[PDB]
Design a protein around this ligand. Sequence first.
Ligand SMILES: *[C@@H]1O[C@H](CO)[C@@H](O)[C@H](O)[C@H]1NC(C)=O
Ligand SMILES: *[C@@H]1O[C@H](CO)[C@@H](O)[C@H](O)[C@H]1NC(C)=O
Ligand SMILES: *[C@@H]1O[C@H](CO)[C@@H](O)[C@H](O)[C@H]1NC(C)=O
Ligand SMILES: *[C@@H]1O[C@H](CO)[C@@H](O)[C@H](O)[C@H]1NC(C)=O
Ligand SMILES: *[C@@H]1O[C@H](CO)[C@@H](O)[C@H](O)[C@H]1NC(C)=O
Ligand SMILES: *[C@@H]1O[C@H](CO)[C@@H](O)[C@H](O)[C@H]1NC(C)=O
Ligand SMILES: *[C@@H]1O[C@H](CO)[C@@H](O)[C@H](O)[C@H]1NC(C)=O
Ligand SMILES: *[C@@H]1O[C@H](CO)[C@@H](O)[C@H](O)[C@H]1NC(C)=O
Ligand SMILES: *[C@@H]1O[C@H](CO)[C@@H](O)[C@H](O)[C@H]1NC(C)=O
Ligand SMILES: *[C@@H]1O[C@H](CO)[C@@H](O)[C@H](O)[C@H]1NC(C)=O
Ligand SMILES: *[C@@H]1O[C@H](CO)[C@@H](O)[C@H](O)[C@H]1NC(C)=O
Ligand SMILES: *[C@@H]1O[C@H](CO)[C@@H](O)[C@H](O)[C@H]1NC(C)=O
Lengths: 429, 429, 429, 429
Amino acid sequence: LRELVVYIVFLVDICLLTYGMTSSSAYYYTKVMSELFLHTPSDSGVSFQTISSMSDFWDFAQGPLLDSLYWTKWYNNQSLGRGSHSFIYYENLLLGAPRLRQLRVRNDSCVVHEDFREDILNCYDVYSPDKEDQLPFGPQNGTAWTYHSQNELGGSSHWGRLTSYSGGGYYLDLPGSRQASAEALQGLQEGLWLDRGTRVVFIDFSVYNANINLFCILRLVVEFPATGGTIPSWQIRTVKLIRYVNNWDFFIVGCEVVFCVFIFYYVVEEILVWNILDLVVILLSIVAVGFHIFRTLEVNRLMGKLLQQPDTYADFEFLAFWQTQYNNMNAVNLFFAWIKIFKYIFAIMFFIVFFAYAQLGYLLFGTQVENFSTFVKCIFTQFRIILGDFDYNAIDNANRILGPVYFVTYVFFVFFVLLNMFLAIINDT
Amino acid sequence: LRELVVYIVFLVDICLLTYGMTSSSAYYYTKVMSELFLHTPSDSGVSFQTISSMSDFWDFAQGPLLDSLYWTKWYNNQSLGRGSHSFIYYENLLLGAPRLRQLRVRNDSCVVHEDFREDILNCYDVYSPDKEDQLPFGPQNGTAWTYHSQNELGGSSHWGRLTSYSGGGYYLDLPGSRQASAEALQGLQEGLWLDRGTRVVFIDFSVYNANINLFCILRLVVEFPATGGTIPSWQIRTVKLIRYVNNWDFFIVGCEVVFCVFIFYYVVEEILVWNILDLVVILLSIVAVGFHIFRTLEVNRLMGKLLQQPDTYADFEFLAFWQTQYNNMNAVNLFFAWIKIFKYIFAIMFFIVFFAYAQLGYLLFGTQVENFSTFVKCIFTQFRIILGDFDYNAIDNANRILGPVYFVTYVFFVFFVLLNMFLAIINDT
Amino acid sequence: LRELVVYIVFLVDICLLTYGMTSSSAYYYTKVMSELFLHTPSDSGVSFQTISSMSDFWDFAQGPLLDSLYWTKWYNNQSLGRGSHSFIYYENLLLGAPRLRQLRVRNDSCVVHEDFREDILNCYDVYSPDKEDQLPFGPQNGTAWTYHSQNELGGSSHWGRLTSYSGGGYYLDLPGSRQASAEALQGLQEGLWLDRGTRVVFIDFSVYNANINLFCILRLVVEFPATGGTIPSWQIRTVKLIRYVNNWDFFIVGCEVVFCVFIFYYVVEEILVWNILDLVVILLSIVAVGFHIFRTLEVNRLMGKLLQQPDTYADFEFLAFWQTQYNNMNAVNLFFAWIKIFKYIFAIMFFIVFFAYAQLGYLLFGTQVENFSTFVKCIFTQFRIILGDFDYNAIDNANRILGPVYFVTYVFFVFFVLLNMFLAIINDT
Amino acid sequence: LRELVVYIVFLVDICLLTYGMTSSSAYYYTKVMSELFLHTPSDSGVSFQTISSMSDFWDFAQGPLLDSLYWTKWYNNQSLGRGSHSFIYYENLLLGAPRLRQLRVRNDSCVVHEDFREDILNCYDVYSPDKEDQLPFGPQNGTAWTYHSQNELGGSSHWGRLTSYSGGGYYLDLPGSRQASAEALQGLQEGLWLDRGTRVVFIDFSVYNANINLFCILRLVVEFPATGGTIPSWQIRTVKLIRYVNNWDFFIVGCEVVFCVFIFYYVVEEILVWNILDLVVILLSIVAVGFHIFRTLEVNRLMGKLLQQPDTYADFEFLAFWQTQYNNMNAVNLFFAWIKIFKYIFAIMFFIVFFAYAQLGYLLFGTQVENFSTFVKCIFTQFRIILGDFDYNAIDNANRILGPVYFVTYVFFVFFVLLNMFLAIINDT
Ligand SMILES: *[C@@H]1O[C@H](CO)[C@@H](O)[C@H](O)[C@H]1NC(C)=O
Ligand SMILES: *[C@@H]1O[C@H](CO)[C@@H](O)[C@H](O)[C@H]1NC(C)=O
Ligand SMILES: *[C@@H]1O[C@H](CO)[C@@H](O)[C@H](O)[C@H]1NC(C)=O
Ligand SMILES: *[C@@H]1O[C@H](CO)[C@@H](O)[C@H](O)[C@H]1NC(C)=O
Ligand SMILES: *[C@@H]1O[C@H](CO)[C@@H](O)[C@H](O)[C@H]1NC(C)=O
Ligand SMILES: *[C@@H]1O[C@H](CO)[C@@H](O)[C@H](O)[C@H]1NC(C)=O
Ligand SMILES: *[C@@H]1O[C@H](CO)[C@@H](O)[C@H](O)[C@H]1NC(C)=O
Ligand SMILES: *[C@@H]1O[C@H](CO)[C@@H](O)[C@H](O)[C@H]1NC(C)=O
Ligand SMILES: *[C@@H]1O[C@H](CO)[C@@H](O)[C@H](O)[C@H]1NC(C)=O
Ligand SMILES: *[C@@H]1O[C@H](CO)[C@@H](O)[C@H](O)[C@H]1NC(C)=O
Ligand SMILES: *[C@@H]1O[C@H](CO)[C@@H](O)[C@H](O)[C@H]1NC(C)=O
Ligand SMILES: *[C@@H]1O[C@H](CO)[C@@H](O)[C@H](O)[C@H]1NC(C)=O
């Protein structure tokens, strides 16, 4: 019964270590930033979410995005007394400069069919890293008009709605004030910096809050499919990077070294079914150990760069990405750490036909309704239908005969099979 | 156990043949075109979905529809360098010309009642093909003002929300550029090309995407009932017609001939309960065989016509219609082909009263709520109520006494009968 | 087994008689008229549903309502060739003239409390027919400014959202054209025809469709509570009044006399448990017999009046009211007539506590959330909660402590009691 | 069986006493006032709910709020004949003057991190009563620019969305007419009366309805977090304070003394399991006794003040607060009083894992989705998921891998554990 007590001590160790990272003021910080950039219309009624075509994109970029970044003067039109830096909502510092970057696809990327070769001289295929266009275009001069590899821009794969994307492309870094920035983007509308070759466009920038201590790092990802049009999407992550606050941070250093003491104790007692869960928990634990040194190194380097050369994009997106997935790992560890307490204290006919419906629904619908438009989405759509959440209008207007047949037939299937499962389990009794 | 293996080979045959037709880039192609034509307002705030009366229709036709068809210049107001053809979203070619066509009903189509014969000199009845008005009207000159049979316009029945419609009517084919087109439709507003006689108005046009290979064929169907007003509706189908891409298309020809080899094998082994499913699967299989020759002939002919005489409507709607229903057939075949693996490895009291509620609900509601407005819609509405999806406000504001009596009473009926079914099945145990 | 056959003959008799009244084109007729009057905004963005205060009402009455009534010219601004009458959507005749009528409450209707007698010289209480103000006001001249009893205006009780209302009040009948009408309502804004005394305002008018045969009779009821503000509400009923169409109407006369033959047969065989249902069905049958003579008399009289003196309100609202409730009666008869085929072929602990929750929820909520704002609404709200339809945000923002306690506690109550019912019924087995 | 009868007499006593307080016209009174202040946009499209930043707040305060308070002239632009007082909707008197009051936080409230000390000279921390800034600011002159304790302003804690707030702060009391008021708030925009130090801003005012007898007391609470931006929120309570109406009020005095007679009878019979419920009911009863004297004293004093010095804020918010919570207490008493009739006539595996999901969901989501943003909200969110109310899009866009794993895994957990509970209970049978 002593190993139990020690185990509890482990639960409060991991508990304080993971709840040390969070903040109850995070949610409103995301909510405020997102509702600042996403929802604010331009004069043309162009929000970010509602971007349709390219001209809408330019109406957005030269629109709110240049007035929701650079704040200078108060609401009473009196100047704000902090020099030359842009404070979003007066309370939020803007780190470095924002960066656009684009991805292009090669001029002739496929074979136009034989009938149309008269009217169509070019094929720009869907994005795949094999076909990415590395040559310059436009006036072919600055870093906006000429390619850059994934090394020259330190970066990882962004994984969007269509397909994953590399880290290269034609970046531009907006200058400090507003006016110079508008001169830039106006310069990119002059020439065509968005043409048929374009595929993905990223806008990255990050913000640091002085009052509490948090970063809001955000990516605005607009995709241009081969079909034309646009698909806007966004990721906004708020993150506690610097863990130094007060002597409490030194209590967090002590907490960390206590934690590694614990894990060494648990590898000692480990080596000599539930022990599966043990080796997992310890595995993700020691994965979580080194990340703090990784982080302190990273932050030290970045704040080094921002210190040296302002008006230069400094990547917080990689660091924020791995910080948040680090938090996900801690969450799963902690959850298992609660499950572990218990250690210290015919269906094939259903699955086959189930996937058969997933497939059928994907074929009949899926060029109409989004919820069916891929296979996994079909699986979870059918699962919600079991749980009693569905939109029948969509299924019914996609195909107004086979729709009701699908819906009804599926309902009777699940209902009926579930029944036979009940009667079988009662037969076991 | 060998016939099993051969059967699996059949499953991968049909599998690759049906998944050969689809594309994962289809959904966004429909989504983009539909959100281009349907949702874009005019200056008057007139979307397509929101069309109310005739003047709204004309505000739409001379509105966005002429600016969401003809694209000429880039977003920077630089000319686009492809000659005279209209590329929607710059990536999508426009095939031929768009076509309006109308259906009229005869001047005196019924008997005005005896009381009103003083104030009402005309009856235009509901549309039925018996009463379709074949005489010219207006200035009585062009092909817009004079009837055309269903042969002179190759076409099949469109089946809309009210009733099915023929393929005849008074067509107009818009010219190439925008300006000439606006001159046309302005010419049709000058005279009354929509008058009390009108019933259905169709706008048909189709689009071919060069980057991927797909067609988006779309019909915009606005109905004018006898009651006045309008009911806008639409059908948008994206279709892979030309299956020739690369040598992979030749692997698709080999796949097809392998498939017919399979079906001949299965008629040989067939002729000498589950065999019901066998004869069905083979039936729809051989139905699916000839459609490819039918299609290659059709496409060959059409692209022949578009080749010969541009600015002439060339029907892709018939071909797209049968291509999509062909895909539905393949979907059902494939689904059965998955079910078939298993071959190789008191209620009357409920139904009577159920339909009795369907009828009651249709009579009490149904001049108010849409979900009840016909009989089949009542059946599926009550079925959703069983599944726990309903809008109680509607039922309650239609009739605020009998509404709750209907809803409650029905709930207790289904609940209670289901109970007695449980207790009965437990009695069988 | 012969009485069975005769009974079936009864089912097809009542079946054809009740389905003779309906029309499948009704729903779109209501939908079109309602979306014409209710939803069309004015220049100020004032729809009918969105009416807030009195100035909004006047912005509506002189707004769309005078342009959604009088139609004169086509969409091409060419005159329409039917003399002086107003055709709504060109297909719908307007019967007679529209009528406003108001209800007033007496000057000093209650006792102002003792503290405020200095600042408040008048009390206008809630509407009850005892306090209705019968004296003239304003310029005190026309029929708009002077009272009229419920006899001088033939009319019945309208039953709205707050309380039932009589048929008297200060009516005004709008003239024929638009311009004279605007002169009228402008004349009623000049003086105050809506002042603190006002309680209910009705706008009644009816429309006859020539193409099909139906009436759309509609009431727009705006209520001004004692609290101030407004509560707009509406009733739109489409009705087949004249049943004369063709010789088929004579087949309907034969059908009626066959029906009365049947009911006499059933009183003969009746007089000499399920017979309860028999006497009910026959009762509502013979109630339904005389209504046709009542109706033919009524319609004959009305069309007499419209024939004699146009530009005079002629009530179709009484007749439409009883026609629709007649249709409800036929619906219930027919439903029982289907049930009748079978003739020819611990809870107190739950109900007490249930009503106890209805009461509690009414007291805690109900000055906030509408669904709880009266007692019956609380009953059906809790019933939906059992059926899994609820809005938790409302309950939670009304009182953010007792709300979740109510919701959770109720859920466990119903869940748990239902359980004990299951185990009890299994004990009976 | 006599104590039963006497008990019923108790039920009708408490019944008439609690139903004496309510009114069926309350709901529309809240609904009307709330839809007057909350939803009415300004010229800039700024509603109250939609307030985003500070400049939006000022656009609201000088916007509708000064035109939804002071009513002078009728809708026909004729003057209203009640002197100098402002009648909202002409039927509602405005009691006293409205009051703004603010809360500030100290200049340097925390330690800026070491890296940023160059660009950031100030930390304004989250609100806690320890850090509240008591010094004057701005021109440092009036009662708007200088602190006031919680005694000098009689007031209690407001408990908002973020944290509880004290009653002190920098109040301003708007003058009588509109013009002087606009001069005031313009004077507060001139200087910065909202600066980085601000945290909460309250607008309090109350309204008395003469026709019925009720008060609508309302607080408009706008919060400025440390993160920037705003969180608007509101409380609107309608209350019957003065219970004097007619001789019926004297029947209410008799009712009260009868009630205390009852409770003395029940302490006599009390002193000599269900008796737990007895001592509770009697406890809250005698708590409810003294509140009437407390109230009559309070109202007497207030109406004394409003009598003496108009244009001075007189607090009805404290009194309304305790009146409504008094009504909540009566509601619970009455509910128990209905329950009481009956007196006179393995799970740990589920709860542990349940809270484990609450925690996991709070960590993974909760910086994205609101429903998860705190721990209790996670508990009730998961409880609704059990009851079949959820938004899957949110969970899925927060984290698009771990989201479905959370949702599915939780569903199988609850489903499966519930099953084993069924089979266990059947084993007990
Ligand atoms: C707003 O600021 C501009 C900055 O140049 C100034 O010219 C203008 O007078 C200001 N308007 C005000 C204070 O109303
Ligand atoms: C295709 O694009 C390239 C850009 O890399 C350009 O140099 C070339 O001229 C284009 N081809 C044609 C036929 O214009
Ligand atoms: C841009 O083009 C001009 C024109 O020759 C050239 O002088 C300049 O160096 C170019 N910019 C860069 C960064 O090379
Ligand atoms: C837009 O194009 C028109 C075409 O004639 C031209 O006259 C005008 O100057 C252009 N406006 C620009 C480039 O801003
Ligand atoms: C009815 O319509 C026809 C069109 O086919 C027209 O020729 C005829 O004159 C119309 N009847 C009357 C009475 O105007
Ligand atoms: C249109 O009417 C004119 C007037 O006579 C005629 O010359 C012309 O041929 C008509 N158009 C056609 C296509 O017949
Ligand atoms: C619309 O009708 C009016 C009626 O007087 C007329 O003056 C005007 O010219 C017409 N406008 C057109 C036909 O565009
Ligand atoms: C009350 O209203 C009546 C209208 O019937 C009016 O004659 C009377 O003068 C009013 N009372 C007062 C005190 O103005
Ligand atoms: C309206 O008032 C005038 C003024 O005396 C009067 O002549 C006229 O008769 C009145 N109208 C009616 C319908 O009595
Ligand atoms: C509205 O009231 C103002 C108040 O001065 C007055 O000048 C104006 O003429 C009035 N407008 C009307 C009655 O239309
Ligand atoms: C901080 O705010 C106070 C207001 O209480 C002010 O007196 C002081 O000057 C501020 N500090 C600095 C460094 O400006
Ligand atoms: C406001 O400031 C002026 C300037 O000295 C002063 O005279 C006045 O008394 C101040 N107001 C109050 C209420 O003290």
